[PDB]
Symmetry: C3
Subunit: 115 residues, 3 copies
């Protein structure tokens, strides 16, 4: 009913601008983003199959946090799947978890109305 | 009972120093902060402006949550744009790396 | 512990030992994580004494890889006895979507 959710996308830095535009059409008014790092770990054979090394790899990643209540989660995740999908790795992932409370500081209101 | 919560504050990068006082005074022993960014989306054609923000994350169990939120509420307010918001969610477990403790004791 | 569940393991710690950490997490089966350079703040009631540190932050979302295996691997590698060893926070993730393949839940990770 008055449920609030956070949608967190971690993805490569591109079409952020296309996303901002489509997420706007569907009801999103504000979001947060940060520049951070991604790291790929793969198991690899050391030469001669003697052992295993962990191939480490580092990337630049965008992280986007969007808390919502009235805009349904299926609609954020589905429009983001859409502008960000390319078929190549670095397309990223979306994490959804739930928010007990939201507080609007400039206006003191709480719960689903503070968004 | 021994519930633990994360409180996430996203606000303009200002007044940080007093927010420290007022929180340490109610029992907050340590917090984490980072510089992020925030933007409004509007309208369809969409126009959006982007401002630097502070992301403050405090994890508590003993210090009542309700006492963190409104200590943040009272002190960060200015009525002007960029007071930001506060997101709270529940934490399943905390582990102290140095002590090995788990649960609210770890904090 | 239980199938279907996904958890975000969140570690805030010293910048040190990050590389032995990647090594070992990589071996209990973690294939990717996110980290960022943040800061830690220390508070003390004396009026209050306030310190500022550089800390590292590691986010790992897991399901098929048990969370007790991740936390213990982290306690081990990161622990030095002294303060700034940092903490681990764990919380449940309702769902994960793999953008490139369209999959959801554990098979997405
Ligand atoms: N399980 C995860 N936990 C935390 N962060 C992740 C996770 N998966 C991806 N990320 C973040 O998303 C970025 C993009 O990852 P992507 O979804 O492209 O994964 P991948 O490396 O292509 O394939 P895999 O599914 O094997 O991880 C990563 O660089 C990382 O910062
Ligand atoms: N739904 C949200 N999801 C993620 N971050 C948000 C959300 N709402 C606000 N924020 C963060 O809080 C910062 C403060 O923004 P502000 O409170 O001015 O949001 P706004 O909705 O644009 O303003 P108002 O609510 O006054 O119309 C934002 O720049 C953004 O970083
Ligand atoms: N309750 C908390 N909420 C949010 N971040 C924290 C919390 N405790 C620690 N951190 C982050 O992890 C870093 C490591 O701190 P550490 O775990 O070493 O605790 P400490 O400050 O040495 O002593 P204490 O046990 O009083 O926290 C901190 O500087 C901070 O960035």
């Amino acid at each position: 009913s008055g449920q609030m959710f956070k949608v967190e996308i971690v993805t490569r830095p591109a079409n952020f601008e296309k996303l901002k535009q489509e997420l706007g059409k569907i009801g999103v008014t504000s979001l947060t983003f940060s520049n951070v790092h991604g790291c790929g770990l793969q198991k690899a054979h050391t030469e001669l199959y003697r052992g295993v090394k962990i191939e480490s790899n580092v990337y630049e990643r965008l992280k986007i946090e969007i808390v919502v209540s009235k805009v349904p989660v299926d609609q954020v995740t589905e429009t983001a799947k859409r502008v960000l999908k390319t078929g190549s790795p670095g397309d990223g992932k979306i994490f959804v978890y739930e928010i007990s409370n939201t507080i609007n500081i400039r206006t003191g209101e709480e719960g689903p109305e503070a968004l």
